[PDB]
Ligand binder design. Sequence first.
Ligand code: HEM
Ligand code: HEM
Ligand code: HEM
Ligand code: HEM
Ligand code: HEM
Ligand code: HEM
Lengths: 71, 71
Amino acid sequence: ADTMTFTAKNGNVTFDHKKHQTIVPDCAVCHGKTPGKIEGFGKEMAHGKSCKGCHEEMKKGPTKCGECHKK
Amino acid sequence: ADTMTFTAKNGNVTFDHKKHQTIVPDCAVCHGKTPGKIEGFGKEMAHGKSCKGCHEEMKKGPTKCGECHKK
Ligand code: HEM
Ligand code: HEM
Ligand code: HEM
Ligand code: HEM
Ligand code: HEM
Ligand code: HEM
């Protein structure tokens, strides 16, 4: 439906945008004031606040390498 | 499901893999013998035969930078 697959040499990472919208109901959490592309998105942001950091803080969702990176 | 994102400093590239699976004759066109991770995939391959080259040769699909790279 609205799943984004981010390529990574160590295993692609599948992100269900629609599901995340259903459970994080404020776009601004991920996008600030402009839902759309996230400037700079890549490894550093994904391993920080844009992906892994939320999972770590909320104790829900993937935090170990292999939970995201699927060979 | 629905799209792949190839992160790039000059604008991420969104790629409808399923659509390409449908219209492009055989997985081997992009994957060789077996579908799996495309070793080396990146700028050189994308600007060559893996992406842009097909679009140019077959006169269908994006060949201009901004048609693929979106900020
Ligand atoms: C210590 C554990 C991890 C290691 C060693 C690791 C390794 C890497 C590496 C090497 C890359 C760059 C890939 C490339 O440029 O081809 C990358 C990117 C990425 N990682 Fe991880 N990763 C880990 C944990 C995670 C986790 C837990 C997540 C999910 C929450 C994640 C999500 C991502 C995403 C989405 C990208 C790609 C951003 C883009 O598309 O450019 N990683 N990771
Ligand atoms: C209803 C609230 C939201 C709206 C309206 C929204 C909208 C969008 C839009 C328009 C895109 C661009 C798709 C494209 O490139 O064509 C996008 C991408 C994205 N969204 Fe959301 N989103 C929302 C909530 C969220 C949430 C809560 C998260 C984090 C959990 C999130 C994470 C992302 C990520 C990682 C991308 C890919 C960014 C990129 O490729 O640069 N979104 N979103
Ligand atoms: C692009 C960055 C992100 C990636 C790659 C990512 C990836 C994932 C994956 C693979 C799952 C498990 C599969 C699923 O249930 O859909 C998941 C679950 C989850 N994520 Fe993320 N996520 C990202 C960003 C975020 C952010 C920024 C937050 C919080 C603000 C968040 C909160 C959650 C939560 C609460 C779950 C648990 C879902 C459940 O238990 O049903 N994620 N995420
Ligand atoms: C002359 C026009 C173009 C320029 C100047 C350009 C520029 C670039 C640059 C600088 C990169 C490397 C990005 C990075 O390392 O962060 C890149 C990679 C890439 N470009 Fe282009 N590009 C052009 C045309 C195209 C077109 C037409 C397509 C689509 C058919 C395309 C698809 C890609 C893809 C898929 C990557 C690889 C991103 C990744 O590593 O995942 N480019 N391009
Ligand atoms: C039905 C035929 C196809 C199958 C079964 C298939 C399967 C796959 C699989 C399993 C992956 C993930 C590989 C990984 O672990 O990274 C993948 C990624 C990819 N495929 Fe396909 N594919 C097919 C057709 C195509 C076609 C026709 C193209 C080119 C037009 C293509 C281009 C790509 C690209 C660029 C990736 C991302 C890079 C990568 O992850 O290796 N695929 N495909
Ligand atoms: C990973 C490499 C490639 C990338 C990033 C890429 C990207 C795109 C994009 C952005 C479009 C326009 C949006 C869409 O119609 O889905 C497109 C269309 C198209 N691509 Fe590719 N492409 C790739 C590889 C290929 C290859 C190898 C072929 C031929 C073997 C091909 C054939 C086509 C065709 C025929 C269209 C036209 C679809 C239509 O008219 O509706 N593409 N591609």
